[PDB]
Amino acid sequence: HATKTRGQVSGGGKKPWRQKGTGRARQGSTRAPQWVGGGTVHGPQPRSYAQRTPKKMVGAALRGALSDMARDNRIFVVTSLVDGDKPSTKQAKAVLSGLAELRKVLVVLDRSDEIDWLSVRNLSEVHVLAADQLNTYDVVNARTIVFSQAGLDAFVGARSA
Amino acid sequence: ARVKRSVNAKKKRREVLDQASGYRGQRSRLYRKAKEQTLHSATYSFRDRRAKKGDFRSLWIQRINAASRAQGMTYNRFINGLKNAGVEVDRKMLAELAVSDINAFNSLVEVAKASQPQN
Amino acid sequence: TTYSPKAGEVQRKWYVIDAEDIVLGRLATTAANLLRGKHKPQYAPHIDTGDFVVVVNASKIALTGKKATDSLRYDHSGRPGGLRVTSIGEMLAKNPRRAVERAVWGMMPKNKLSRQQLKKLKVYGGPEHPHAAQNPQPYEITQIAQ
Amino acid sequence: MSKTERPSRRAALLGDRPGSYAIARHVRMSASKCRRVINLVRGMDAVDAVTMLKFQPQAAAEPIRKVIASAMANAEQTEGLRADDLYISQAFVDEGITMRRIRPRAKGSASRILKRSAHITVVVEPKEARQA
Amino acid sequence: AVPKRKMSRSNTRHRRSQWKTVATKLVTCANPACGEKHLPHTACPSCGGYGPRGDRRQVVEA
RNA sequence: GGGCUUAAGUUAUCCGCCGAAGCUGUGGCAACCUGUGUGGUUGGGUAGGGGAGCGUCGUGUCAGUGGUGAAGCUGCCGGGUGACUGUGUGGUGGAGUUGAUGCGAGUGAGAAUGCAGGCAUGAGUAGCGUGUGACGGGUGGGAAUCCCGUCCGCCGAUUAUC
RNA sequence: GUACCCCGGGAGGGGAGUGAAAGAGUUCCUGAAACCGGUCGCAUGCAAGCCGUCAGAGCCUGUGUGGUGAUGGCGUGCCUUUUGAAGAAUGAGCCUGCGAGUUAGUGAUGCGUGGCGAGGUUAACCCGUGGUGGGGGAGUCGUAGCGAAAGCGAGUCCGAUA
Ligand SMILES: [Mg+2]
Ligand SMILES: [Mg+2]
Ligand SMILES: [Mg+2]
Ligand SMILES: [Mg+2]
Ligand SMILES: [Mg+2]
Ligand SMILES: [Mg+2]
Ligand SMILES: [Mg+2]
Ligand SMILES: [Mg+2]
Ligand SMILES: [Mg+2]
Ligand SMILES: [Mg+2]
Ligand SMILES: [Mg+2]
Ligand SMILES: [Mg+2]
Ligand SMILES: [Mg+2]
Ligand SMILES: [Mg+2]
Ligand SMILES: [Mg+2]
Ligand SMILES: [Mg+2]
Ligand SMILES: [Mg+2]
Ligand SMILES: [Mg+2]
Ligand SMILES: [Mg+2]
Ligand SMILES: [Mg+2]
Ligand SMILES: [Mg+2]
Ligand SMILES: [Mg+2]
Ligand SMILES: [Mg+2]
Ligand SMILES: [Mg+2]
Ligand SMILES: [Mg+2]
Ligand SMILES: [Mg+2]
Ligand SMILES: [Mg+2]
Ligand SMILES: [Mg+2]
Ligand SMILES: [Mg+2]
Ligand SMILES: [Mg+2]
Ligand SMILES: [Mg+2]
Ligand SMILES: [Mg+2]
Ligand SMILES: [Mg+2]
Ligand SMILES: [Mg+2]
Ligand SMILES: [Mg+2]
Ligand SMILES: [Mg+2]
Ligand SMILES: [Mg+2]
Ligand SMILES: [Mg+2]
Ligand SMILES: [Mg+2]
Ligand SMILES: [Mg+2]
Ligand SMILES: [Mg+2]
Ligand SMILES: [Mg+2]
Numbered sequence: 001h002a003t004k005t006r007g008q009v010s011g012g013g014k015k016p017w018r019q020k021g022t023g024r025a026r027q028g029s030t031r032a033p034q035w036v037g038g039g040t041v042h043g044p045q046p047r048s049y050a051q052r053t054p055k056k057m058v059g060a061a062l063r064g065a066l067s068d069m070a071r072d073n074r075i076f077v078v079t080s081l082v083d084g085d086k087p088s089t090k091q092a093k094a095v096l097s098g099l100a101e102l103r104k105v106l107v108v109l110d111r112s113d114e115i116d117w118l119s120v121r122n123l124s125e126v127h128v129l130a131a132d133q134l135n136t137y138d139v140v141n142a143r144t145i146v147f148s149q150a151g152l153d154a155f156v157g158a159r160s161a
Numbered sequence: 162a163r164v165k166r167s168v169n170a171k172k173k174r175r176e177v178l179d180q181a182s183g184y185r186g187q188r189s190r191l192y193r194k195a196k197e198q199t200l201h202s203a204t205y206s207f208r209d210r211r212a213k214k215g216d217f218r219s220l221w222i223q224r225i226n227a228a229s230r231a232q233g234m235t236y237n238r239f240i241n242g243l244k245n246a247g248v249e250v251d252r253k254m255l256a257e258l259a260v261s262d263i264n265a266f267n268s269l270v271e272v273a274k275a276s277q278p279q280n
Numbered sequence: 281t282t283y284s285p286k287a288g289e290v291q292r293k294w295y296v297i298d299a300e301d302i303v304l305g306r307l308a309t310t311a312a313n314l315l316r317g318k319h320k321p322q323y324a325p326h327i328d329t330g331d332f333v334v335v336v337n338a339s340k341i342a343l344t345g346k347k348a349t350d351s352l353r354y355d356h357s358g359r360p361g362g363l364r365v366t367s368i369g370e371m372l373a374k375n376p377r378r379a380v381e382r383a384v385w386g387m388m389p390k391n392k393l394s395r396q397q398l399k400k401l402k403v404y405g406g407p408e409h410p411h412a413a414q415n416p417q418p419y420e421i422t423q424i425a426q
Numbered sequence: 427m428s429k430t431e432r433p434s435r436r437a438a439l440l441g442d443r444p445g446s447y448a449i450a451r452h453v454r455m456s457a458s459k460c461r462r463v464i465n466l467v468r469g470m471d472a473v474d475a476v477t478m479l480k481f482q483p484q485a486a487a488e489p490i491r492k493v494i495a496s497a498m499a500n501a502e503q504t505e506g507l508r509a510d511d512l513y514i515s516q517a518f519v520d521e522g523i524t525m526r527r528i529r530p531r532a533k534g535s536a537s538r539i540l541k542r543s544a545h546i547t548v549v550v551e552p553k554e555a556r557q558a
Numbered sequence: 559a560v561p562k563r564k565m566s567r568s569n570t571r572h573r574r575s576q577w578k579t580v581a582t583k584l585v586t587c588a589n590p591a592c593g594e595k596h597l598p599h600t601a602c603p604s605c606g607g608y609g610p611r612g613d614r615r616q617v618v619e620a
Numbered sequence: 621g622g623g624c625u626u627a628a629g630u631u632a633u634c635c636g637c638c639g640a641a642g643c644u645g646u647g648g649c650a651a652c653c654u655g656u657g658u659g660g661u662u663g664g665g666u667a668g669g670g671g672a673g674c675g676u677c678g679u680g681u682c683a684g685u686g687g688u689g690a691a692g693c694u695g696c697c698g699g700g701u702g703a704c705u706g707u708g709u710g711g712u713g714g715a716g717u718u719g720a721u722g723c724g725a726g727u728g729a730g731a732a733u734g735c736a737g738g739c740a741u742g743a744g745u746a747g748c749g750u751g752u753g754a755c756g757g758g759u760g761g762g763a764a765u766c767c768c769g770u771c772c773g774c775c776g777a778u779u780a781u782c
Numbered sequence: 783g784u785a786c787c788c789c790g791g792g793a794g795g796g797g798a799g800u801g802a803a804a805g806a807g808u809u810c811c812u813g814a815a816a817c818c819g820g821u822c823g824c825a826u827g828c829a830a831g832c833c834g835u836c837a838g839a840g841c842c843u844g845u846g847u848g849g850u851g852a853u854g855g856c857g858u859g860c861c862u863u864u865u866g867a868a869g870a871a872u873g874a875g876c877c878u879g880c881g882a883g884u885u886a887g888u889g890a891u892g893c894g895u896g897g898c899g900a901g902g903u904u905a906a907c908c909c910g911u912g913g914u915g916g917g918g919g920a921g922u923c924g925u926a927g928c929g930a931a932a933g934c935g936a937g938u939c940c941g942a943u944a
């Protein structure tokens with residue numbers, strides 16, 4: 001997001017009229033902020049909103065978010081969804097058998113778990129993640145998480161005491 | 162997130178133009194001129210809500226003075242007589258009695274006359 | 281709610297005062313009180329509740345000291361050198377009604393209602409007044425003890 | 427919420443009463459100068475009004491006379507009324523579009539000139555409605 | 559001189575209301591065959607005649 | 621100021637009353653202190669410091685809602701200690717938007733001889749830029765101001781011609 | 783994109799048609815305020831008005847509350863700047879819109895809050911073409927001070943191992 005200041009608005013180089021004698025207010029440029037078509041004083045400028053949250057804080061928040069619905073019994077683990085070739089009908093079933101429809105799926109296998117990924121990709125009430133990208137926002141937004149066996153194993157292996 | 166001022170701005174203007182809905186000239190048509198009079202109106206109303214006590218007490222005292230002087234007794238002697246007799250009927254009820262129940266007011270005048278120090 | 285008179289609710293009476301040997305100040309205070317109706321328990325500043333006052337023998341109003349020739353009355357026409365001055369004795373001799381009206385008006389509030397009420401004062405320098413039809417009752421200037 | 431009995435000029439000016447009306451929009455004359463003659467013509471009988479406006483010296487008489495004649499014709503056609511028993515029940519002039527122009531003046535200045543315009547409305551009803 | 563202050567609505571209207579005109583009076587043409595309205599002491603624009611019922615004289619060829 | 625010495629003047633003295641948003645009575649609100657059943661003290665306020673909020677726009681989430689009519693605009697009837705507001709009830713209108721809780725601001729205007737537009741005031745006022753036009757007829761819905769004609773006037777080292 | 787008819791020279795309007803809607807008729811969505819008017823209610827031609835406020839009759843209305851307001855009291859605008867302004871000091875004709883405390887730094891220094899805690903924390907960059915996640919401890923602050931420094935060290939420096 002960006003705006004043009006009085007220095008960036010086109011024109012406005014010269015004094016509009018003499019300082020005295022005209023009976024008009026003293027003006028310095030036609031692009032002064034109080035003019036129609038003039039520059040914006042404190043309008044937005046491009047920026048980044050990223051915050052340097054500590055690693056321990058980010059990880060712990062993730063642990064607490066996962067733990068709340070672990071205690072609430074909202075994590076299921078499946079060996080996999082779908083067999084052979086890949087449909088969305090199959091996994092829709094596997095998950096509806098699990099429970100409800102505000103879902104998170106973990107399949108971790110970042111390179112070749114196309115079967116499960118592309119099956120659950122189009123549900124629109126399922127969010128699919130790799131185990132190395134769980135993140136607190138998605139965990140909190142999820143009403144339940146279903147891990148693939150490999151997904152849970154890889155998350156545990158990536159972070160364990 | 163550019164914000165346009167009009168929707169929020171008009172609220173106080175409508176309030177003030179409603180508050181100034183009997184004024185003469187610009188004071189009931191123009192928000193800026195109505196705003197100046199509403200400040201004066203609020204100051205006058207606050208001042209007059211406290212001066213009203215004195216105004217009505219003065220009216221009651223004048224009516225009591227007239228009613229008691231009709232009985233040959235000044236207001237000060239009448240009030241001192243009531244105070245000595247121990248009748249704590251106030252300026253207000255006394256004025257209402259004077260206007261409405263003149264016989265009861267005259268009986269109170271007799272009470273004050275009897276309760277006078279006579280000195 | 282305090283009582284308030286309603287237009288013609290209070291009935292206005294007619295009094296007559298013989299200004300024979302009565303000081304101008306006392307006469308004017310009494311006239312102002314009667315005209316404004318301050319002796320009535322129904323008094324209200326905003327509604328005329330007073331009575332009509334007919335003053336007779338205004339030419340025989342008593343004055344103390346050297347007022348009859350040293351107490352001056354001034355009028356100005358509103359133009360340069362437009363002052364006239366006459367002593368209260370001369371004014372009582374010539375136009376007593378003007379003198380009594382000036383005194384009463386000075387003692388009466390400065391109001392549109394006061395201007396209206398001052399018309400209720402009928403001043404005559406002689407002992408006779410033409411308002412027998414209105415049947416004015418005699419009024420005696422008195423004082424209440426203590 | 428929009429629906430039925432939608433507002434109309436006839437409903438606002440007559441409201442189920444007999445009579446008619448006529449509007450001349452964008453009359454190329456000033457509203458005040460039109461009002462100067464509207465004030466005279468309001469409340470008169472329609473035939474008397476048009477005959478008088480044939481003789482009224484002001485330039486506003488002509489458009490107002492034509493409006494009154496048009497209202498009379500509208501009444502005669504849409505309510506069977508006759509021209510000789512109509513009277514001008516209402517008559518007013520509102521302001522229309524104004525054009526800003528420039529008149530050059532001394533010392534290089536330019537003075538604003540306003541070419542104003544008016545809308546004229548006349549409402550005619552049978553004379554029996556005068557005492558109603 | 560220049561107007562010191564903007565005149566109030568009451569005063570502006572008090573002065574403006576006096577800018578008006580009187581209605582033209584009109585008189586019925588004495589000619590029975592015309593019966594139209596014309597200005598007093600003026601030839602009838604319709605019949606183009608002038609004078610009383612009896613001694614009528616043509617004035618305007620219209 | 622009226623008027624006043626027949627004090628409504630001065631003075632000593634006595635008895636009453638009037639008189640403030642002061643004090644007291646009664647009802648509501650608030651800050652602080654205190655042992656925490658009580659109570660006490662306090663609450664004019666510019667520069668300025670501290671604290672807690674209203675409204676607008678965007679937005680995460682949840683709950684929604686909308687042609688059986690959103691936004692906006694505009695009445696009425698109400699509400700709050702304030703900014704303000706109703707989950708009251710109409711009208712206009714025609715496609716969005718409410719509540720909870722967070723997040724982000726081009727977040728609030730009466731002033732800057734502020735900027736843009738619209739419109740008043742003066743005012744139906746001043747002016748309409750050197751002057752000579754008259755009349756008959758015509759045209760036309762409409763003619764002092766167009767056309768034709770006749771009188772008359774004006775320029776003519778230029779009001780001509782190139 | 784208004785056939786046809788009527789008044790009109792037209793412009794414009796009145797009927798009628800089209801359309802869910804024409805008071806969506808091309809100046810066309812919504813249509814606010816200044817500003818200009820018609821109608822109705824009340825007041826107003828003896829009155830000295832920072833235009834209000836408190837008291838208050840009458841009339842109208844009663845959609846039993848609202849509109850108006852005779853008359854009485856009290857009452858010298860807003861802002862700026864000032865010892866002090868209703869000021870005959872400044873600015874503002876009016877409405878609508880716009881118009882001024884912002885943002886960036888692994889800046890400086892407090893506070894609130896959260897994490898970890900004798901430790902805290904990464905920067906560049908690498909991986910995640912899948913992001914907001916993981917790696918990266920190079921550095922940096924804390925961990926001992928005192929001295930110009932060599933240096934010494936819970937001491938050090940001036941001093942004479944004072
Ligand atoms: Mg430049
Ligand atoms: Mg410059
Ligand atoms: Mg620009
Ligand atoms: Mg008294
Ligand atoms: Mg609505
Ligand atoms: Mg030039
Ligand atoms: Mg005048
Ligand atoms: Mg008090
Ligand atoms: Mg107190
Ligand atoms: Mg108390
Ligand atoms: Mg305070
Ligand atoms: Mg205090
Ligand atoms: Mg402050
Ligand atoms: Mg629905
Ligand atoms: Mg919106
Ligand atoms: Mg919200
Ligand atoms: Mg802003
Ligand atoms: Mg504004
Ligand atoms: Mg100027
Ligand atoms: Mg402008
Ligand atoms: Mg004007
Ligand atoms: Mg004139
Ligand atoms: Mg003039
Ligand atoms: Mg003139
Ligand atoms: Mg002239
Ligand atoms: Mg000329
Ligand atoms: Mg000419
Ligand atoms: Mg010729
Ligand atoms: Mg010549
Ligand atoms: Mg020659
Ligand atoms: Mg529909
Ligand atoms: Mg509409
Ligand atoms: Mg328009
Ligand atoms: Mg529109
Ligand atoms: Mg009168
Ligand atoms: Mg005075
Ligand atoms: Mg000074
Ligand atoms: Mg000034
Ligand atoms: Mg002044
Ligand atoms: Mg100065
Ligand atoms: Mg100025
Ligand atoms: Mg301005």
Ligand SMILES: [Mg+2]
Pocket residue numbers: none
């Ligand atoms: Mg290191």
Ligand SMILES: [Zn+2]
Pocket residue numbers: 587588589592593594602603604605606607
């Ligand atoms: Zn004729």
